[PDB]
Design a binder for this molecule. Structure first.
Ligand SMILES: Nc1ncnc2c1ncn2[C@@H]1O[C@H](COP(=O)(O)OP(=O)(O)O)[C@@H](O)[C@H]1O
Ligand SMILES: [Mg+2]
Ligand SMILES: [Mg+2]
Ligand SMILES: [Mg+2]
Lengths: 50, 313, 309, 312, 312, 312, 312, 48
DNA sequence: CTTCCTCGAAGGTTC
DNA sequence: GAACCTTCGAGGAAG
């Protein structure tokens, strides 16, 4: 159920449902929570710079 | 061509022309490019013409484009790659550049490089493109709407000004020599006096007198022919049109100088509100013939003495 | 036809007509194209008519478009691509073109080339020598950089009684209706100085003579027809007379405010100011003052009242 | 029906009606379309009604639309080119068209053609579109809001005027026969004199009297029922409403006739400044009960002899 | 429920009720929809409540919306498309509608149709939307803002009046029974004299007194509880607030009753110029405490005795 | 946490607390919600805190939003559908809510139902929502910026005033007890007088003086330290801010004391009109530094002797 | 140095710099994050530089972004998720971010967590995210433009201000060494005076004088050369630019010092009226050359004597 | 070469070019061994 | 970018 | 000379 919850949370943050699905779908961890997924889906998409 | 090509030929603008010469010579005394330059002034004083002279005097090639033609960062970056060491890039109406591109220019001007960021997360990387030294030259008519971070990068400023009778006359003399027509110096002075200090107006008047002189005359512009031509046209010795005279005459004869509102004056001369405020009123203010007040327009003593009517406070 | 075709047919406008003849002859003698011309002035004076006469005198084929139709740069670029050497492009109501399109014109008028971006791509055009003619009623609405590029400015003026009399007779012969010289003069006085208004009266008077008369316009029919239309010999309408009468008999000539006067005649405020007052002020029947407007001595004599300062 | 259909039935407007008869007859003898017509003037005087009468007398089909519906040039360009030779186009509330759309009519009205841009991309091209002979009819309350170049193109101008008591009495009697009620000639005049000169108001009063006569009466309108019903509506013999009477009374009893300012008068009657100046004051001035002066409003002698005081 | 549901429960407004009864009964006999009606006047007097009563007496469903909710003509067309034969449409704050949408009702009210443009935009044409019979009810606080052509189409006009003490007292009693509270007739009269003639104010005071009377009273609204509770709420025995009292007191102690100008007085009370003229002064004039004069305004004898000073 | 949570902890505002206690208690005997309440006055006096206290005393949940956060009618519908029976909705900056949305609150407050149109085109349809009982608490910095239709629907009003020296002293002593800190009575009284009568300023300054007493002192707040710390900050002996000093120094030097309008002054001091009118002007006027005049504000003699100028 | 790392190396801003030192080390003694800090003042004074110094003195890695770079709430949450305990987040033009961000930033700054609500009707849940301690540093060009409830969360205010003559001479001297230009103390002071308080102007003038002195002299910037170079640049000894002299010179010769309005003035000299009242008038009024009378601008006595005109 | 091909295409996308047009622009370059800088330089240069 | 409208100034009368 | 009333004119924020 955390899969849909994470996507629903990202939709609230302004991500499109299609992109939120693709973003969350890139991550895979059956035991991850909606919170730990969100903390990963965002880190994977933000462009870090040095 | 009509446009001058070198400082030796460029008439007037001695203030800006004198300053630029010192900066250009100091740049040549070093293996360096000229500082970024911005040109200010009203329409029609040579802002476009001056850019070419700077390039020729620098001994460099000139790249030319306009603000509206640039809409994506790649447009500017692609043009910037074309620039060889010391090349001059001229951007017209630089104030119309979109923010999407305006924001890219800062690192280019200050560091001569662009650093394109790409990727995301662990794939986040950037590529660094070295740019050869160059000098950006900008021209604008509405400087007040530039952003402050851009204005902070320009190191040289030039304010254009209206030409004056001793030099505006020489532009008529020279232009009359491109056509095959002889003109007396006294006739050229009469044309300059009415050109409002603007080169385009002087050239337009000369073209109109040329047609008359070769159809209603012997094809020579003498003082006698000039008076007839300038009598067929409405332009007075102060440069006032027929309607300009009608405005002043109306205010003095019917309202005793005012104050009078814009709407009331428009219906008396049978013109649109927008036309009197934009076509005719601006020059009357600069010449000092009328003032604008919270209660309406009012004529000044300077206007009374020109029309030839008695004046009393 | 109603529209004159050559300067020999064009009555009046002696100032503008004289200048255009000099510049047209000089251009032909040099085999060059005419400079860009701007025509402006009040409605109904002849701006559109003069544009066609210029083309006929130059001996060229005229391309015609209008400002409201050009919505995007692609529209104007297609039109400009069809111009050949010496062609004349006429744009009516030029004041409506979006300023995004005028900026494309700044360079095309001076250097005769177009180098612009337009699914987006670049486009380049080299333009042959051509003459642009613009006509507008709101000249001040054009940008200062555009007005500075026009080389000829023609400002239209109102006509005089002798010119209008000659125009009325010319139009009468097209309708093949007989009219006397003094009858034609009585219509001219009422035409407010405008050729279009003079033609409108003639059309209405003709309709009366065909139904209530013998199909001939004479000093007797004209007086009856004009009384039915209720147009004074100074050209004042029924409502115009009601305004002056109300001011002289209820406010002693003024001053009175626009709001007070409008409600007293049962008229809308915007209609009095924009449709009736302009002609009354230009003819000198009313004057505006800081406290209101007052009827002048000319109004008293016309209405038949004793003036007292 | 409640709207007249021919000049035989259109009572009043002698000036406008007489002119249209001559111009319509002349147009038929020459076998050509009627010139463009603009109808303007106060509300409820018969502008819309006359537009249909013209179409019937000309014997052609009438196409109808309104200014508020036309919002872009595409709409007007589509209405045009759907016209057949001799059609009549009627636009109501013509003052609402955008000025960018009015300027398209300039060529259509004078030269029967319009310039159009067609296609896309490299296929973009201009073309002339040619129109058959047609007559445009406009109706508006705000003629001063139209552009000067547009008003100059209308060839016929009709300014409507208020009706007189003989004409209004006949209109009431005609309407009384569309319904099934008998009305005495003496009672018909009693309504006409209270209708402020407007046909719509005369019809409204009759409808209200009909409802009273068939509830509190025997279903017939006579001087007795009329007098009673008008007492319930509280409309005096001059057409003054309840609030109109209160204004005049207060001016004569507290300020001795004035001069008095609009604000001071509004607060004393518990009305607001805008309702008094826009709803009630306009009719009181046009009928001569109030006079406006630099110092304020003043009650005239006609008001004193109407309210029953002495003009000392 | 607080809102009256039928003409038998609706206290006051005798002039408006008497007329509406006759017009509603006559409409039923003919089996037709009722003519359009406009309700206007001060806030809180019962305009919205009267609209619901009319719907119940006619026996139809009432659709409800408001002027400022409509922003473009598309919204109005959607609302009218939902109408069913005989429905009543109530529009609150009708004067807030934009003029461009107000002019669309002109044809709907007189002829029950609307001109609408249809099609994707490349090909399009106008068509008549035909509306069923319906009754429009409008309510407004300032009818003077409506255009003349709109006001002329309403067939019934209802001008609301402030309530008198006899009727306003019955409203306080009626409300007490719904709240299951006991109130002595002397106490009901006290609340009425302080309610400025407005039912909305009377109900608000009763709710606050009821809370006080049961927390530190003995559960009954006696004449002594009302005096104490109304002191806490800061409502004078004439309905004046502390700001109103400050104005009157200053005029008596610092100017001997005036005359004094509005600008001078406003500064002496630390109040904004326009607030005093629009928010506080109107009630003081209507009640007779202040009088405007050509040289300023003066406090009358009534204002002196109410404060206890000596008149001279 | 510093925020009080019950009426026993909330210091000051005796006039407001006394009324809320009665109404909240009376609303507990009956099993119903509290009436809608409007709180207004200067910023930082504690009106947001009162909303939490009201919720805790009733024993219900609190939801919080602001006028600017609601952009369209659909936003409010989503919020109102998420309220349980008896919940409290708190709306800050209520005076900035969009007019098209404010019209929807009137119905929800007065009748507890919402009529809304949903969908588009042929799918456009109305919805009727029936809401559970709830209490709206509104907060505004401007007493008179609300519309009269809105202000009339609130059943309870509370004007909040600046705190006096004894109250702020107790608030400073309480705050210095939540933090691990020690303060002498002499220092607490000094800091209170310096705190512009505002609790938010008092708490903010105490946090800063605490830091100075540790690095530049022995970790204890004494009058000798408090004087130095407050003089290192810009806080004047009278508690005037840097903005306050600019205002007074500009009026006395650029206008010779005035009069000057606050509108033109706003742009000369480079401060937003609404901030200077609502945050700063009220204190300077209420404490006698600035006085009102017909033309505008003028600096009093007290201001000249404070800034050290000569009262010429 | 010109690009300092620690406060001892930073030139000027002694007031702001002295306050930060106490707060920075005080936070270290308690081993906790620093309070949120708001920097404000004119542009180009060194706000961005100071943010790096604060990070070094704390001993933390700086993270940087800007208001316009944030477009949706998720953007900020992502950045905040990437934070490490003690990190400092710098936001330039913090007032430009959309309100949808501020709604989340509040609880982030105050509670160090965010609670994204989800579900509707019978479904309602949230996700609760823990955040490590951090310090927010914001910089703006104005104070009043910041959201009121946001401005209350910042605990430290840093008012930046224009540099004094001693500081500018030191900056000029350091910059000259980078260019390898030899400049005497008198020449450095002359440039400092005319740079009118801003380092960017001081750098620009020095570069230009270098070019002149390298050609019109021996590469040594002497006082005699510096004064000649400045007259060639047309820079007045009071720091008035070319256009500034034109405004003053125009008022004296064409209007006798005025009064004259901004509309007329902006038309006489070919300029955009906004530019004059925004760029040029501020410096001329602050220095006492121009006064903003209600009738219009007027030239003061200083301007007459400064420009070299005999006063009236 | 996929590293340089992807970098050049992705960097070109960061400059506002469409993915398809960016692919075509880079696809026109023959030399795979040249660095992304040379690839983007020539790609932008050829489109000038 | 434009129209509306509202805020301000001032002419004139009276006590 | 203080207080009322009417009329005109130019901005600016709500479309
Ligand atoms: N009576 C009081 N007792 C204790 N603390 C108070 C009191 N009033 C306000 N405060 C404190 O001061 C601050 C006031 O903030 P808030 O109540 O939100 O102000 P407002 O809502 O008026 O803008 C809070 O920190 C609050 O705890
Ligand atoms: Mg140029
Ligand atoms: Mg034409
Ligand atoms: Mg009609």
């Amino acid at each position: 159920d955390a899969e849909q919850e994470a996507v629903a949370a990202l939709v609230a943050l302004g991500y499109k449902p299609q992109e939120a699905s693709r973003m969350v779908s890139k991550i895979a961890r059956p035991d991850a929570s909606s919170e730990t997924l969100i903390r990963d889906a965002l880190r994977a998409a933000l462009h870090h710079h040095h | 061509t009509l446009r001058p090509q070198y400082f030796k030929e460029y008439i007037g603008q001695d203030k800006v022309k004198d300053q630029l010469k010192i900066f250009i010579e100091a740049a040549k005394l070093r293996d360096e490019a000229l500082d970024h330059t911005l040109l200010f002034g009203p329409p029609g004083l040579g802002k476009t013409t001056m850019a070419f002279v700077i390039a020729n005097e620098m001994g460099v090639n000139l790249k030319q484009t306009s603000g509206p033609a640039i809409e994506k960062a790649g447009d500017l970056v692609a043009i910037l790659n074309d620039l060889e060491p010391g090349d001059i890039l001229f951007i017209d109406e630089i104030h119309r550049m979109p923010m999407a591109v305006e924001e890219v220019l800062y690192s280019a001007m200050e560091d001569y490089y662009i650093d394109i960021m790409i990727g995301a997360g662990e794939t986040s990387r950037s590529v660094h493109l070295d740019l050869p030294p160059f000098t950006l030259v900008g021209a604008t008519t509405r400087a007040g709407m530039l952003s402050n971070p851009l204005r902070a990068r320009f190191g040289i400023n030039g304010h254009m000004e209206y030409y004056e009778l001793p030099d505006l006359t020489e532009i008529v003399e020279r232009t009359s020599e491109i056509f095959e027509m002889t003109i007396t110096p006294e006739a050229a002075l009469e044309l300059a006096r009415r050109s409002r200090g603007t080169p385009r107006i002087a050239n337009r008047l000369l073209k109109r007198v040329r047609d008359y002189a070769q159809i209603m005359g012997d094809g020579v512009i003498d003082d006698k022919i000039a008076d007839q031509a300038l009598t067929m046209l409405d332009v007075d010795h102060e440069g006032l049109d027929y309607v300009d005279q009608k405005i002043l005459r109306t205010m003095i004869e019917m309202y005793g100088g005012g104050p009078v509102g814009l709407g009331t004056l428009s219906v008396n001369i049978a013109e649109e509100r927008e036309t009197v405020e934009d076509m005719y009123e601006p020059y009357l203010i600069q010449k000092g013939f009328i003032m604008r007040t919270r209660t309406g327009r009012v004529a000044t003593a300077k206007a009374y003495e020109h029309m030839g009517y008695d004046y009393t406070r």
